[model samples]
Target: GRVVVVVTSEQVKEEVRKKFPQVEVRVVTTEEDAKQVVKEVQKKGVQKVVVVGVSEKVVQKVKQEANVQVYRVTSNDEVEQVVKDVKGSGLEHHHHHH
Candidate 1:
């Protein structure tokens, strides 16, 4: 399981990749696209998802998946730092507990 960063556009994906080139990223504007991203990553060993600059509606759908962890950020600029912080803490692969 790995972190799959989600953005609203290629431009935003580029912005995120500038600092985090090793991070996996996908561009999605709607729930359909978000669903595809999630589905694709599930088979590719993905567990945690970080959504940047995505709409609440779309993000909500992503959160419905129980097999994955979803983190939301309102700005693309925060994407890099969030991934860095999570990776550093080993939370990217660790499942959350109540």
Candidate 2:
């Protein structure tokens, strides 16, 4: 299974789940919380992380801690869009005629 991580404090987890249930949304209101979540994701070997509406400090920490691809988006809607793109990546048997 492909795993994508999302970092945000906004109330959009449910919304993201609706479109991309495979995405793991982590909500953080403080930088400390952000670090914790990043650590957890790193252990899980997550390759992609999407940050929406989070401070540069948090994003910087994530980049420094996790050696994974990070995507910074401005809006909540963009979060879903970005996730969709990540989801489509590295996929096999995307579509085929049987």
Candidate 3:
């Protein structure tokens, strides 16, 4: 378990790592999927799930079920800031393969 980023599409996932190689962009599609990703991180630590285009249901599951810090990004533009914020949060292990 470690810090991870779950995204929507491959393209944005690509962009996430394209200009910013610091991030660990990934793809997780369902509530259970998001849950596992968060749970994995919590195994090592708790925080940082880059679940882009995630549904409200999925969000709720991660928030309540996973019971950890959850970050959501809808706009691609905001994702960069989110990445910055997460990195600033000292959760670099979640990305950058650090």
* Model 1 local distance difference test score: 0.72
Please tell me which predicted candidate would have the highest lDDT against the true structure: 1
By how many angstroms RMSD does model 2 differ from the true structure? Answer: 7.6
* Candidate 1 TM-score over all chains jointly: 0.71
lDDT of 2 by residue, 27-64 (tens): 67777887788778778767777776667766776687
List residue ranges in candidate 2 displaced over 4 A.
1-7, 87-98
Question: TM-score, each model?
Answer: 0.71, 0.68, 0.63
Ranked by TM-score, top first: 1, 2, 3
TM-score computed on alpha carbons, candidate 3:
0.63
The number of clashing residue pairs in each candidate reads: 0, 0, 1
Model 1, poorest ten-residue lDDT window? 85-94
Better of 1 and 3 by lDDT: 1
Q: Give candidate 1's error at residue 57 in angstroms.
A: 3.0
Instruction: Please give, for residues 14-93, the per-residue lDDT of candidate 1 as tens digits.
Output: 87777677867787887677777787888887767788767666667657764556778866456656676664435556
Provide the overall lDDT of each model, using Cα atoms, as 2-decimal numbers.
0.72, 0.67, 0.63
Query: Which lDDT tens digits does candidate 3 get at residues 4-72?
Result: 566766776677777567545556765566556665666766566666777766677657766656677
Give the clashing pairs for model 1. Answer: none
